[PDB]
Amino acid sequence: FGIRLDGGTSYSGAIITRYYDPLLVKVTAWAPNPLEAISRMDRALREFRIRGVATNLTFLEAIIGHPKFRDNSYTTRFIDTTATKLLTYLADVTVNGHPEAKDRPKPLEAARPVVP
Amino acid sequence: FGIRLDGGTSYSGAIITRYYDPLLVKVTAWAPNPLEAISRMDRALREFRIRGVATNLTFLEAIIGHPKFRDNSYTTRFIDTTATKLLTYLADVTVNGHPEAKDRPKPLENAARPVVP
Amino acid sequence: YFVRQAAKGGIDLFRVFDCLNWVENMRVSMDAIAEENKLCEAAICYTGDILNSARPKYDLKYYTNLAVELEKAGAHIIAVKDMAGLLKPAAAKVLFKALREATGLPIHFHTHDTSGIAAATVLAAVEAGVDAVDAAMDALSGNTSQPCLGSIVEALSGSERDPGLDPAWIRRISFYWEAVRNQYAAFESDLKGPASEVYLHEMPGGQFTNLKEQARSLGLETRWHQVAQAYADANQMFGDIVKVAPSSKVVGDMALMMV
Amino acid sequence: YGNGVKDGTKQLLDTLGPKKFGEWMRNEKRVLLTDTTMRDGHQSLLATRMRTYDIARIAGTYSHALPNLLSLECWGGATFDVSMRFLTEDPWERLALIREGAPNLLLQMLLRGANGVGYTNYPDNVVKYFVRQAAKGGIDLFRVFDCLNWVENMRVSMDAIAEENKLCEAAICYTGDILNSARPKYDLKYYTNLAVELEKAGAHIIAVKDMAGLLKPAAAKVLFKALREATGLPIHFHTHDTSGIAAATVLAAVEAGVDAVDAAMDALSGNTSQPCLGSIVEALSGSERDPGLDPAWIRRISFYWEAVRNQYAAFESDLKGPASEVYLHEMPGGQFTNLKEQARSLGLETRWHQVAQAYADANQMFGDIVKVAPSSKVVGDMALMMVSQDLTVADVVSPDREVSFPESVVSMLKGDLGQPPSGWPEALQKKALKGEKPYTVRPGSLLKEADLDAERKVIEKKLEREVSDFEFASYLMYPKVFTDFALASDTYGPVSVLPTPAYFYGLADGEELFAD
Amino acid sequence: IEKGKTLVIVNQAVSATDSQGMVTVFFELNGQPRRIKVPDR
Amino acid sequence: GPISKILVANRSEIAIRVFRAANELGIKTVAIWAEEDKLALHRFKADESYQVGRGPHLRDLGPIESYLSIDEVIRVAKLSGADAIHPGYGLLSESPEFVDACNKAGIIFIGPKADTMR
Ligand SMILES: [Cl-]
Ligand SMILES: [Mg+2]
Ligand SMILES: [Zn+2]
Ligand SMILES: [Zn+2]
């Protein structure tokens, strides 16, 4: 509800080169009132999943929650003046084994323990 | 402008399972008229590009491009009582090969297409 | 019915041949062609060696006679169909002189470069006055195909019988064909060039490769040396016959079988 | 599959000597035949990768089955360094093996005067030394050529060969079209004059080396008539079947009186190789000049090669049959293989058609030169880059275009390949050579004569054992390549003794191998 | 497809083979989405 | 006579904005692309799209300089037979040089007149 999107330049696997405006989408949030506008905008801004290339979403979510935007006390110098590790370990042991076990008895081929 | 999308499940990488209601993405069109709603819903639907699974976008445009619907002469019994060959080849052969080439030498990777002088 | 439609369709020159050279078996077609008002090139199939006294069934009188019969039957053109590329340059010197003395019809010569000396025969043939010859574009010539068009043309360039074909354009087209042919990597034979043994067995260009990839299919791959002789023998056992689709085939099946 | 060996041209040479042997060739009615299968054949089709193992084993059949053969071309050309560099094997041991297998035929090497087996230019005494060992090693017939057809650059070699009492066949390289008034530089007088000069220089035989298969049959008729009127020596004709009409030319030449001709066994003939031997013999059979070679045997041997050739699948080229473009570009047969597969390796597999046109152009820009190893290379390099840098000929010779000319071009233009009769084109060379100064004399004649005893000492100390005159000869020709082979030998024993499949691929599992 | 009249065709993706053993090829055809169903032999 | 066909002398979304406002009205679209813009969706979301910058008529022209080159614009407004050039914003949208070639070809600039640009 109340999120207009003007994008379509970006998608999974697309290439963004560096010769133009690097605008990904234009998120536009509307609200019944000016403040339900920001939380709607801040919810979209967060909800987003982009990866492969870096983003200003964490700069945008730092602009819209700062009390000077919330009540209209900004000027034109508001801005200018204010798990892999896990997949890695797995693969690492999947490939070389654990040194504390790799050369000893293995468990039977096995009831995972079940908490009562 | 004017379109809303209730998203959630559809992306690149998505896994679509036959255990549940087949709802990929719900779409809602807005216009200051009920005959621009129809083209604002026609437009978005024609813009979608979903690869991997089929959809009813052809049927979804079909109902809103239909003479009975577009002007409100319609009821609740409305629906109940209402190149390709060439892409078939291509598809078939891309999935299964041609029998005459299937188990023989392929061309160099790597080869200039013939140009008429 | 078929010759009718073929003529409707766009064929102008019909080279008509019979796989045992039997004129009786050519008339229906020759008549048909002539009724459609098109060109009837009646082919005589070449085989043996006119200059080999030791195999006299296929001597020179054999061809010139067939030339005359074929004229009588209403040929517009006579073709020598050398399907296994067996005619040799010295024989060409003789054969085309003889035929052009035996009939007043034009002579058309068609051959294969299996021996890898077909171009030689074509040039001798031309020296002897033969009226027309077949060649393939370079990109598709040599081996079991025809001799090289470009190279034959170059060789005649500026002689009294110059065919005046633009060898620049020949190259240009040939390059295109070369491109086309790369696409067909699937259907390339494993034959690497000249084989003089064509003179022992006489298997036609069409069917020398096919037979070798029959001969392996069947596990005698180490043996297309005896198959070679068997074909030659079987041929003689049949009474020494003309071997071109589909006679050739028959002989092959036998040779395979005997081995 | 007999009994002992009929005496052949080998015995004939030993009794007559080179001079009277040649007059014998001249006087013989039957055309004479050289089989090129063991050298030029696989050079042109298989990248000279054929191994001693396959080649030694067929010497005795040749010896018994085809005793009428004039010679086996079986040494020289690229085989000298290829064997060592890529096959891990001694070419002297190859030569020895064929010598003991065929004690009745002449054994023939291609020799490039100035340089012998020559990757470069050697003092006269090194060329002299080399020919001496080659005559010790088993060679009877040396076909000597010079990549510019500069007789001057062949005098050393010819004198050496003669000195050793062996056949000196001086070759004239054929290029252009003697019947094309348009290209007057390579006319008939060009060749006939050359024949006469080669005769004065002491040749026992004149060869026509048509390295790119450019002779056409109509010209073979003119040329060979002319040559035989111009010199009383016998004429030997070599050619390649790149146009797919060399067999015609050969047949034309034979009618014309030519004394000997080359051909390759059928299984390694055609394309950039020689015309087919079986089929030329069959065409001649029963004629006045009938060579008298047993076509049943030709076939048997051919079949053996065919099998042998299947082993070397990996060195087969992408060339698919007759190419009349040869008249346009003029790339020699022994350099139509390496080049278009070098052009792949460079990222120019799709644009080898363009290359050809500049290689044609280049030739003209260097001034229309004979192109045979190594002039031929130097020429490849120019088109290679006129395309890699997308340059034209006024662009190659452009004051405002920094071309980084290949070494080989730098070198030839300086003097190391010698002189074409017109000299080199000043401006290209003035720009090409970048301040470095050119010369115009015989490169041979500027070189300090090799201190053989010293140089021998260098190599002997290096292997840490004495070496044989032969092995030493190898080192003078190719120090680095020989050094390596010598050490690769010390590690691996006589791998030449291995069957080709084992040599290139070792052994499957459970597989058993007899190795002598 | 005619002397007109070019079809621009792109192969977008293919799917894992299903049950009924039918594969679905996803084409672009003059900038529009089509999908075609083929069995996998 | 109506405007049946629209060129977007622009790229990116704002092109994509216009194709839509236009499309919902039955109006046909037209795009333009650089060489380095050979992948930009808008070119595919157009009803039709021709290249700009590259080719034997140019050496080539730098990615953006081509989206600016008014040699190219016209050359493509014509080639499609399109009758109103919607410059969008940024890039070229406020130049008279762009409303003098559009007046050299007779096309309709969806904005203010030419000398309103100076
Ligand atoms: Cl070296
Ligand atoms: Mg003689
Ligand atoms: Zn045929
Ligand atoms: Zn050669």
Coordinates of C-alpha atoms in Angstrom, one line a residue, chain D residues 198-411:
Chain D
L198 CA 73.5 -23.4 -61.6
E199 CA 75.2 -25.6 -64.2
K200 CA 78.3 -23.4 -64.1
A201 CA 78.2 -23.6 -60.3
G202 CA 78.7 -27.4 -60.6
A203 CA 75.2 -28.9 -60.1
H204 CA 74.9 -32.5 -61.1
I205 CA 71.1 -32.0 -61.5
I206 CA 68.7 -29.0 -61.7
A207 CA 65.5 -29.1 -59.6
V208 CA 62.4 -27.0 -60.0
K209 CA 61.1 -26.4 -56.5
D210 CA 57.5 -25.3 -56.9
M211 CA 57.1 -24.7 -53.2
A212 CA 53.6 -23.3 -53.3
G213 CA 52.3 -25.5 -56.1
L214 CA 52.1 -22.5 -58.5
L215 CA 53.2 -24.1 -61.8
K216 CA 50.2 -24.6 -64.0
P217 CA 50.2 -27.4 -66.6
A218 CA 50.3 -25.1 -69.8
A219 CA 53.5 -23.6 -68.3
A220 CA 55.1 -26.9 -67.3
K221 CA 54.9 -27.7 -71.0
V222 CA 56.7 -24.5 -72.0
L223 CA 59.2 -24.4 -69.0
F224 CA 60.5 -27.9 -69.0
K225 CA 61.0 -27.9 -72.8
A226 CA 62.9 -24.6 -72.3
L227 CA 65.1 -25.8 -69.4
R228 CA 66.1 -29.0 -71.2
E229 CA 67.1 -27.0 -74.2
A230 CA 69.0 -24.6 -71.9
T231 CA 71.1 -27.0 -69.9
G232 CA 72.1 -30.6 -70.6
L233 CA 71.7 -31.7 -67.0
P234 CA 68.7 -33.7 -65.9
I235 CA 65.7 -31.8 -64.5
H236 CA 63.8 -32.9 -61.4
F237 CA 60.4 -31.3 -60.6
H238 CA 59.0 -30.8 -57.1
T239 CA 55.5 -29.5 -56.4
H240 CA 52.5 -29.4 -54.1
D241 CA 48.9 -30.0 -54.7
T242 CA 47.3 -27.0 -53.0
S243 CA 45.3 -26.1 -56.2
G244 CA 44.3 -29.7 -56.5
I245 CA 45.8 -29.8 -60.0
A246 CA 49.4 -30.5 -59.4
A247 CA 48.9 -34.1 -60.7
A248 CA 48.0 -32.5 -64.1
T249 CA 51.1 -30.3 -63.9
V250 CA 53.2 -33.4 -63.1
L251 CA 51.7 -35.2 -66.1
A252 CA 52.2 -32.2 -68.3
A253 CA 55.9 -32.0 -67.1
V254 CA 56.5 -35.7 -67.9
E255 CA 55.2 -35.4 -71.4
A256 CA 57.4 -32.4 -71.7
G257 CA 60.5 -34.5 -71.1
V258 CA 61.2 -33.9 -67.4
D259 CA 63.6 -36.5 -66.0
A260 CA 62.3 -37.0 -62.4
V261 CA 59.3 -36.1 -60.3
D262 CA 58.4 -36.1 -56.7
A263 CA 55.1 -37.5 -55.3
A264 CA 53.9 -38.8 -51.9
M265 CA 52.2 -42.1 -51.1
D266 CA 48.5 -41.7 -51.5
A267 CA 47.7 -41.6 -47.8
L268 CA 49.8 -38.5 -47.3
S269 CA 49.3 -36.8 -50.6
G270 CA 47.1 -34.1 -51.9
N271 CA 46.3 -30.8 -50.2
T272 CA 49.5 -29.1 -49.2
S273 CA 51.5 -32.2 -49.7
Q274 CA 52.6 -33.6 -53.1
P275 CA 50.3 -35.0 -55.7
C276 CA 49.3 -38.6 -55.3
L277 CA 52.0 -41.1 -56.2
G278 CA 49.8 -44.1 -56.8
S279 CA 47.6 -42.2 -59.2
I280 CA 50.4 -40.5 -61.2
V281 CA 51.9 -44.0 -61.7
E282 CA 48.6 -45.4 -62.9
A283 CA 48.1 -42.6 -65.3
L284 CA 51.6 -43.2 -66.7
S285 CA 51.2 -47.0 -66.8
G286 CA 51.6 -48.4 -70.4
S287 CA 52.9 -45.2 -71.8
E288 CA 56.4 -44.7 -73.4
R289 CA 57.7 -43.1 -70.2
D290 CA 56.1 -45.6 -67.8
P291 CA 58.0 -45.6 -64.5
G292 CA 57.5 -49.4 -63.9
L293 CA 56.4 -49.2 -60.3
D294 CA 54.2 -51.9 -59.1
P295 CA 50.9 -50.3 -58.2
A296 CA 49.8 -53.3 -56.0
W297 CA 52.8 -52.4 -53.7
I298 CA 52.2 -48.7 -53.9
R299 CA 48.8 -49.5 -52.5
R300 CA 50.0 -51.8 -49.8
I301 CA 52.5 -49.3 -48.6
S302 CA 50.0 -46.5 -48.9
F303 CA 47.7 -48.4 -46.6
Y304 CA 50.5 -48.7 -44.1
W305 CA 51.0 -45.0 -44.1
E306 CA 47.2 -44.4 -43.7
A307 CA 47.3 -46.5 -40.6
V308 CA 50.4 -44.6 -39.4
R309 CA 48.7 -41.3 -40.1
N310 CA 45.7 -42.1 -37.8
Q311 CA 48.1 -42.1 -34.9
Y312 CA 48.9 -38.4 -35.4
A313 CA 45.3 -37.2 -35.3
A314 CA 46.3 -34.2 -33.1
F315 CA 48.5 -32.6 -35.7
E316 CA 45.9 -32.7 -38.4
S317 CA 44.9 -29.3 -39.8
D318 CA 41.4 -27.8 -40.5
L319 CA 42.1 -27.6 -44.3
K320 CA 39.4 -29.2 -46.3
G321 CA 40.7 -29.6 -49.9
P322 CA 41.7 -27.8 -53.1
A323 CA 42.2 -24.1 -52.8
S324 CA 42.8 -22.0 -55.9
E325 CA 43.5 -19.0 -53.6
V326 CA 47.0 -20.3 -53.7
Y327 CA 47.5 -18.4 -56.9
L328 CA 46.6 -15.2 -55.1
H329 CA 48.6 -15.5 -51.8
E330 CA 51.3 -18.0 -52.7
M331 CA 51.9 -19.5 -49.3
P332 CA 54.1 -22.6 -49.6
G333 CA 52.7 -26.0 -48.7
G334 CA 55.1 -26.5 -45.7
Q335 CA 53.8 -23.1 -44.4
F336 CA 50.0 -23.3 -45.0
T337 CA 49.6 -25.5 -41.9
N338 CA 51.6 -23.7 -39.2
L339 CA 50.4 -20.2 -40.1
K340 CA 46.6 -20.4 -40.0
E341 CA 46.9 -22.3 -36.6
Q342 CA 49.4 -19.7 -35.4
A343 CA 46.6 -17.2 -36.4
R344 CA 44.1 -19.1 -34.3
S345 CA 46.5 -18.9 -31.3
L346 CA 46.6 -15.1 -31.8
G347 CA 42.9 -14.4 -31.9
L348 CA 42.5 -14.2 -35.7
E349 CA 40.8 -17.5 -36.6
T350 CA 37.9 -15.7 -38.3
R351 CA 40.0 -13.3 -40.3
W352 CA 42.4 -15.5 -42.2
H353 CA 40.8 -14.5 -45.5
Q354 CA 41.9 -10.9 -45.1
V355 CA 45.4 -12.0 -44.0
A356 CA 45.9 -13.8 -47.3
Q357 CA 45.3 -10.5 -49.3
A358 CA 48.0 -8.6 -47.3
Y359 CA 50.4 -11.6 -47.5
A360 CA 49.8 -11.1 -51.2
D361 CA 50.3 -7.3 -50.8
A362 CA 53.3 -7.6 -48.4
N363 CA 55.1 -9.7 -51.0
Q364 CA 54.5 -6.8 -53.5
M365 CA 55.7 -4.3 -50.9
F366 CA 58.9 -6.1 -50.1
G367 CA 59.2 -6.1 -53.9
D368 CA 57.7 -9.5 -55.1
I369 CA 60.1 -12.0 -53.6
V370 CA 60.5 -15.8 -53.7
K371 CA 58.8 -17.1 -50.6
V372 CA 60.0 -20.4 -49.3
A373 CA 61.5 -21.2 -45.7
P374 CA 62.4 -18.8 -44.3
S375 CA 61.5 -15.8 -46.5
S376 CA 58.0 -17.2 -46.3
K377 CA 57.8 -16.7 -42.5
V378 CA 59.1 -13.2 -42.6
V379 CA 56.2 -12.5 -45.0
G380 CA 53.5 -14.1 -42.9
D381 CA 54.5 -11.8 -40.1
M382 CA 53.7 -8.6 -42.1
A383 CA 50.0 -9.6 -42.9
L384 CA 49.7 -11.0 -39.3
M385 CA 50.2 -7.5 -38.0
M386 CA 48.8 -5.4 -41.0
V387 CA 45.6 -7.1 -39.7
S388 CA 46.4 -7.2 -35.9
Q389 CA 47.1 -3.4 -36.2
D390 CA 44.7 -3.0 -39.0
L391 CA 47.2 -1.4 -41.3
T392 CA 47.5 -0.9 -45.1
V393 CA 50.8 -0.6 -47.1
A394 CA 51.1 3.2 -47.3
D395 CA 50.2 2.9 -43.6
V396 CA 53.0 0.3 -43.0
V397 CA 55.4 2.7 -44.7
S398 CA 53.9 5.8 -42.8
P399 CA 56.2 8.5 -41.2
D400 CA 53.3 9.1 -38.8
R401 CA 52.6 5.5 -37.8
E402 CA 54.8 3.7 -35.3
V403 CA 54.8 0.1 -36.5
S404 CA 56.8 -2.3 -34.3
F405 CA 58.0 -4.6 -37.1
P406 CA 58.6 -8.2 -36.3
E407 CA 62.2 -9.3 -35.7
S408 CA 62.2 -11.6 -38.8
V409 CA 61.3 -8.6 -41.0
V410 CA 64.0 -6.5 -39.3
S411 CA 66.4 -9.3 -40.0

